Design a protein around this ligand. Structure first.
Ligand SMILES: OCc1ccc(Oc2ccccc2)nc1
Length: 209
């Protein structure tokens, strides 16, 4: 059972801008997704300070980076607070309408795409490198769901029957054919060291063989 939704017009506009603007500094997508993961981990940690049972779904607070050259995917896994179905539909838990408005005003006033995270819509930088993004998520208060979009104005939401995650979010980037550098260990390490040195959670880069 798959539900198909239209993006709000302003979010479709944001994604079109990200996909169509010539902008070479694509590597910032990883900083933005890791920052979202850190924010998610902060939220479940804060909730656990007064209610330890919030961590019954998993006590470990971490971020895993999983490249897969056979599938051409880069997956960013966190064990943060996750998102409900309602969160997924409401632009992955963002205030994306007002964030997009502020972002595009900043771009016409001299900003560049790398500042996207300052406007709370950093998730959508995934489309700098991905032709399709799948988000699997599990929040303590809801069931496990899969969101997916190849842009083009629509996204789908379905109950996920895949491997149970316990709690957290998995962002699966189906990379564009010319963006496979972001599956290479030395490239991912370089980006993490450059942009994510002060993230307060362990970031484990998985290797392949
Ligand atoms: O990288 C995009 C992304 C978006 C959301 C997300 O989970 C949450 C869920 C609730 C609050 C903060 C973060 N994790 C990754």
């Amino acid at each position: 059972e798959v539900e198909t939704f239209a993006f709000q017009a302003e979010i479709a506009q944001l994604m079109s801008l990200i996909i169509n603007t010539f902008y070479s500094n694509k590597e910032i997508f990883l900083r933005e997704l890791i920052s979202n993961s850190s924010d998610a981990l902060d939220k479940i940690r804060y909730e656990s300070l007064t209610d330890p049972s919030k961590l019954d779904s998993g006590k470990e607070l971490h971020i895993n980076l999983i490249p897969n050259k056979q599938d051409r995917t880069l997956t960013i896994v966190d064990t943060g607070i996750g998102m409900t179905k309602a969160d997924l539909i409401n632009n992955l838990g963002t205030i994306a309408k007002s964030g997009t408005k502020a972002f595009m005003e900043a771009l016409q006033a001299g900003a560049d795409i790398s500042m996207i995270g300052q406007f709370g819509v950093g998730f959508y930088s995934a489309y700098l490198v991905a032709e399709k993004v799948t988000v699997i998520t599990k929040h303590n208060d809801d069931e496990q769901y899969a969101w997916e979009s190849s842009a083009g104005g629509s996204f789908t939401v379905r109950t996920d029957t895949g491997e149970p995650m316990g709690r957290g979010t998995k962002v699966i980037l189906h990379l564009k054919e010319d963006q496979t550098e972001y599956l290479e260990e030395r490239r991912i390490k370089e980006i993490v060291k450059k942009h994510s040195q002060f993230i307060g959670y362990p970031i484990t880069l998985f290797v392949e063989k």
